[PDB]
Write a protein that binds this DNA or RNA. Structure first.
Ligand SMILES: [Mg+2]
Ligand SMILES: [Mg+2]
Ligand SMILES: [Mg+2]
Ligand SMILES: [Mg+2]
Ligand SMILES: [Mg+2]
Ligand SMILES: [Mg+2]
Ligand SMILES: [Mg+2]
Ligand SMILES: [Mg+2]
Ligand SMILES: [Mg+2]
Ligand SMILES: [Mg+2]
Ligand SMILES: [Mg+2]
Ligand SMILES: [Mg+2]
Ligand SMILES: [Mg+2]
Ligand SMILES: [Mg+2]
Ligand SMILES: [Mg+2]
Ligand SMILES: [Mg+2]
Ligand SMILES: [Mg+2]
Ligand SMILES: [Mg+2]
Ligand SMILES: [Mg+2]
Ligand SMILES: [Mg+2]
Ligand SMILES: [Mg+2]
Ligand SMILES: [Mg+2]
Ligand SMILES: [Mg+2]
Ligand SMILES: [Mg+2]
Ligand SMILES: [Mg+2]
Ligand SMILES: [Mg+2]
Ligand SMILES: [Mg+2]
Ligand SMILES: [Mg+2]
Ligand SMILES: [Mg+2]
Ligand SMILES: [Mg+2]
Ligand SMILES: [Mg+2]
Ligand SMILES: [Mg+2]
Ligand SMILES: [Mg+2]
Ligand SMILES: [Mg+2]
Ligand SMILES: [Mg+2]
Ligand SMILES: [Mg+2]
Ligand SMILES: [Mg+2]
Ligand SMILES: [Mg+2]
Ligand SMILES: [Mg+2]
Ligand SMILES: [Mg+2]
Ligand SMILES: [Mg+2]
Ligand SMILES: [Mg+2]
Ligand SMILES: [Mg+2]
Ligand SMILES: [Mg+2]
Ligand SMILES: [Mg+2]
Lengths: 208, 96, 23, 136, 116, 71, 86
RNA sequence: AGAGUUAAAUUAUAACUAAGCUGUAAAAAGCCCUAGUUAAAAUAAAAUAACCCACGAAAGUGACUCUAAUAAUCCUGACACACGAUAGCUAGGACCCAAACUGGGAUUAGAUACCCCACUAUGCCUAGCCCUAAACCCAAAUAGUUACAUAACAAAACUAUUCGCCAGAGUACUACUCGCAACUGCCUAAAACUCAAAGGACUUGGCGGUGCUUCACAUCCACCUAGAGGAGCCUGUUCUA
């Protein structure tokens, strides 16, 4: 907010800048962009042009940080990706050739998958009518859903571990079980879905 | 209007017609009056709000060494003169 | 407004009928 | 001049659905009441082939009012009817309530083909007096 | 055509008995009534119901039906963009008449006369 | 206007309802509206003409009134 | 009840679109005033309370008629203005 | 005012069919001798036309047909005469539906109410009473004029001829009288006492669990994060001392 409304966001992707020549409306557009003498924001410190940056991992990284510890959250995440990695190597070498073709060794694909699979389709909002609060079925916008998945994973592997158990480990377990849909996280997604199905009549109430 | 009933001549198929004899008798006296004021060297202010003719009436008046006011008319204008126009001021001798 | 006159009447009537029942 | 709606009971009109006269096509009665909906699909011969109510569909005292419930009853009704092999339905809505449209749609979406809608909603020509209005 | 006002109103002259009792005097006002904002219904309800039935039959495995779900989100995006579009749509007016600002200026330009 | 020509009276009745159109639709004098109305009611009780729908025979005849149902 | 059935208040859907045909029938009833009558007749309405309705309706109809006319009469002069900034 | 008639709807009561049906903000009770469909008299009430403005002295009168039928060569006029919505009373019929009362059910601190469900006097007919209404268009009748003219507001201001009515506010549609098919009634209608007011219309505010539009940007709601209320302690009030 030390930025006036005059300052537009930085677009940080390099592939965009290096290879413009085949795109007309985008050539027009970024021409408008810098030609407008557009005051543009100092790019954040978390966003980098690193080839290794996955925005989803960043968000999930943040939401795990208590206080101001980037260092610590970064480390816990790193250890989670790592933990899943090694756990999947262990599953690989102890398996049969068919399953060697099957198994996912990429902790990243495992992560985007275990989140795609944990995200609820519909969710509830309370509506006040005639004195009572009814929980009613609301279709959700994607970002809210992503958030719900991540929030759930973090809250689940935060709360229910036995104290001798480190975060990255349990988190890895929950990731791999949510991968196969058998994990408690998905039990949660399902209790959402069931609660929505029971109240489906009340989907009349919602006016928007 | 109800006060035109004498000045009228009569209704031709719904459209009303003035009496031109009366127009001349009246206009004569009007123009005579106008003149006798001008000769006596006094202010004359034309006024109209009508848009079609705005230009005319200024273009007329500017050429007479007479003044027009064709515009929005601020409220206390003649009534409260010295506050609106200036600390002390002369007012139109005749308004047209 | 004129209701405020009627109110009086309304009451005085009601309070009378009640009376004539007991009495 | 295509699709003049009201086909006459005289035989001057040859238009067949499943090779049947319009007189022979099944009548689906829909009754939309403020608290309820019920469909009953009947033969041109007046032998009931299907019945579904918003309650028979397992909704309860309030919720059974909604259009959701209406289409719900409509589907299963057209299921029971389709079981006895009715392709086409001329529909009549009785009453004016929440589940009018919903149930009619419910017959289509429920896989039952609709030819006609006609509204028979009882309209007193000033017969029996209604019950009193409410707050009072 | 406009309903006859002759003999309707209670007046000293009138030999008849009243027809209309106006609550507010019958005069064209200068201004015009402001636009009436329309309310909403429940959006998307159909796809919601279909997808409910699907999970009921399929014991709630989301992997079993992709179709009902993707159509559900199709509806959600159609709904949200319908709201954005009905927000920028204020050029709508009556679609063949003019927004109540225009009517009101225009009506102040040729006002109605009660007095004189 | 006679109560005997049901075609004529059919001309002023709503086809789906059996309603009687008002002046603002039919566009008749006062006396002719009234005449038509009474005529119709007579035609209904005596039963030359039905109440709740326009007799199909007469649906294809010339249409007088200003109503647009189907748009 | 004594009349032949299915002739009254009947639309027949064309090209198999149901929703369109229902809209159509609805437009019928609402054009003739039957919906306002059903809704009116759910409960009773006492004679006095009825003439009040009538009169309020008819006043309002007069007003709206007139105001409509006036609007559509002044419509011409909505045209962009000639004399601007005189 | 008679006499005759019924289109829509509803109900008996059968034939099928399904277990529910009804009912609200949400429910409950209620009913399954229920519900949908198909048949069907009586009783009651008269969609649209009516965006019309007619008929009657007023009350009132708008499904259909026929009979009878709407005073006065037309000024005003009662305590006399004849009528007079609803409700109510008397006797006899009627009873689809509605419904004071009442009994259930919710709501509520309570709920003798608003909401729900039954069911009754009663609305309906024939005969007899009762004679009251915000019986108000709060605007008397009959001839006129648009001259003069704005307390306010509302339906603009006034002559002329009449009758009826009004002398502060309560007290008081009351107490006594008189008369009435009324006997918790109607009509006529005071004083003691108390007060310095009581009233009508308006003006700005403020207010509104009125209506409409537009917002809230840490902000009411939905949403995000981190805490308070629990524990120990610090420290401030309040009480006891
Ligand atoms: Mg008193
Ligand atoms: Mg009626
Ligand atoms: Mg009351
Ligand atoms: Mg008269
Ligand atoms: Mg009157
Ligand atoms: Mg008023
Ligand atoms: Mg029947
Ligand atoms: Mg009407
Ligand atoms: Mg009799
Ligand atoms: Mg019948
Ligand atoms: Mg029946
Ligand atoms: Mg029955
Ligand atoms: Mg309800
Ligand atoms: Mg129960
Ligand atoms: Mg009407
Ligand atoms: Mg009338
Ligand atoms: Mg006479
Ligand atoms: Mg006399
Ligand atoms: Mg009486
Ligand atoms: Mg009585
Ligand atoms: Mg009874
Ligand atoms: Mg009986
Ligand atoms: Mg009952
Ligand atoms: Mg009780
Ligand atoms: Mg309370
Ligand atoms: Mg209430
Ligand atoms: Mg009963
Ligand atoms: Mg009676
Ligand atoms: Mg009256
Ligand atoms: Mg009144
Ligand atoms: Mg009086
Ligand atoms: Mg008199
Ligand atoms: Mg007389
Ligand atoms: Mg005079
Ligand atoms: Mg004043
Ligand atoms: Mg006194
Ligand atoms: Mg009294
Ligand atoms: Mg007395
Ligand atoms: Mg006396
Ligand atoms: Mg806050
Ligand atoms: Mg605030
Ligand atoms: Mg705490
Ligand atoms: Mg504490
Ligand atoms: Mg101290
Ligand atoms: Mg102390």
């Amino acid at each position: 907010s030390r930025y006036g409304p005059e300052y537009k966001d930085p677009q940080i992707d390099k592939e965009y800048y290096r290879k413009p020549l085949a795109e007309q409306t985008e050539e027009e557009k970024y021409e408008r962009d810098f030609k407008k003498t557009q005051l543009i924001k100092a790019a954040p410190a978390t966003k980098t042009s690193s080839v290794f940056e996955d925005p989803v991992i960043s968000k999930f990284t943040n939401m795990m940080m208590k206080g101001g510890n980037k260092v610590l959250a970064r480390s816990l995440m790193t250890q989670t990706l790592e933990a899943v990695k090694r756990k999947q190597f262990a599953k690989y070498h102890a398996a049969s050739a068919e399953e060697q073709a099957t198994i996912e060794r990429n902790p990243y694909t495992i992560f985007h998958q275990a989140l795609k699979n944990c995200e609820p389709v519909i969710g509830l909002v309370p509506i006040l009518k005639g004195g009572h609060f009814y929980q009613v079925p609301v279709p959700l916008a994607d970002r809210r859903r992503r958030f719900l998945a991540m929030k759930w994973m973090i809250a689940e592997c935060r709360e229910k571990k036995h104290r001798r158990v480190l975060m990255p480990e349990k988190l890895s377990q929950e990731l791999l079980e949510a991968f196969h849909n058998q994990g408690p996280v998905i039990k949660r997604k399902h209790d959402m879905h069931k609660m929505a199905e029971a109240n489906r009549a009340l989907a009349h109430y919602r006016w928007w | 209007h109800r006060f035109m009933e004498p000045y009228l001549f009569g209704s031709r198929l719904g459209q009303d017609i003035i009496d031109l004899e009366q127009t001349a008798a009246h206009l004569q006296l009007a123009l005579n009056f106008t003149a006798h004021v001008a000769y006596r060297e006094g202010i004359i202010l034309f006024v109209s709000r009508h848009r079609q003719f705005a230009h005319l009436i200024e273009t007329t008046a500017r050429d007479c060494g007479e003044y027009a006011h064709t515009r929005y008319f601020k409220g206390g204008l003649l009534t409260n003169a010295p506050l609106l126009l200036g600390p002390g001021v002369r007012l139109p001798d005749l308004i047209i | 407004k004129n209701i405020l006159k009627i109110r009086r009447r309304k009451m005085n009537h009601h309070k009378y009928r009640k009376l004539v029942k007991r009495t | 001049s295509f699709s003049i709606y009201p086909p006459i009971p005289g035989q001057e009109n040859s238009l067949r659905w499943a090779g049947k006269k319009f007189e022979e096509i099944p009548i689906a009665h829909i009754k939309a009441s403020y608290n309820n909906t019920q469909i009953q699909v009947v033969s041109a011969a007046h032998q009931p082939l299907a019945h579904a109510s918003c309650g028979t569909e397992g909704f309860r005292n309030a919720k059974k009012g909604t259009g959701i419930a209406a289409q719900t009853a409509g589907i299963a009704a057209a299921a029971k009817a389709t079981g006895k092999g009715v392709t086409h339905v001329r529909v009549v809505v009785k009453g004016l309530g929440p589940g009018r449209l919903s149930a009619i749609k419910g017959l289509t979406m429920g896989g039952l083909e609709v030819i006609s809608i006609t509204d028979n909603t009882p309209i007193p020509h000033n017969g029996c007096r209604p019950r009193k209005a409410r707050r009072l | 055509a406009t309903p006859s006002l002759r003999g309707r109103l209670a007046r000293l002259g009138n030999p008849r008995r009243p027809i209309l009792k106006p609550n507010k005097p019958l005069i064209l006002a200068n201004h015009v009534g402001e636009r009436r904002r329309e309310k909403g219904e429940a959006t998307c309800i159909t796809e919601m119901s279909v997808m409910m039935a699907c999970w009921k039959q399929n014991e709630f495995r989301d992997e079993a039906c992709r179709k009902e779900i993707q159509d559900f989100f199709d509806c959600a995006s159609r709904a949200e963009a319908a709201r954005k579009m009905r927000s920028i749509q204020e050029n709508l007016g009556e679609l063949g008449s003019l927004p109540p600002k225009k009517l009101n200026k225009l009506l102040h330009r040729f006002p109605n006369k009660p007095h004189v | 206007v006679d109560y005997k020509n049901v075609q004529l009276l059919s001309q002023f009745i709503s086809p789906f309802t059996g309603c009687i159109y008002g002046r603002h639709i039919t566009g008749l004098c006062g006396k002719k509206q009234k005449e038509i109305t009474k005529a119709i009611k007579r035609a209904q009780i005596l039963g030359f003409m039905p109440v709740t729908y326009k007799d199909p025979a007469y649906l294809k005849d010339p249409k007088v009134c200003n109503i647009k149902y189907r748009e | 009840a004594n009349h032949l059935k299915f002739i009254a208040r009947t639309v027949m859907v064309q090209e198999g679109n149901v929703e369109g045909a229902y809209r159509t029938l609805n437009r019928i009833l609402t054009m003739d005033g039957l919906i306002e009558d059903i809704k009116r007749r759910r409960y009773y309405e006492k004679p006095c309370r009825r003439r009040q309705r009538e009169s309020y309706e008819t006043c309002r109809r007069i007003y709206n008629m007139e105001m409509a006319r006036k609007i559509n009469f002044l419509m011409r002069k909505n045209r962009a203005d000639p004399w601007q900034g005189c």
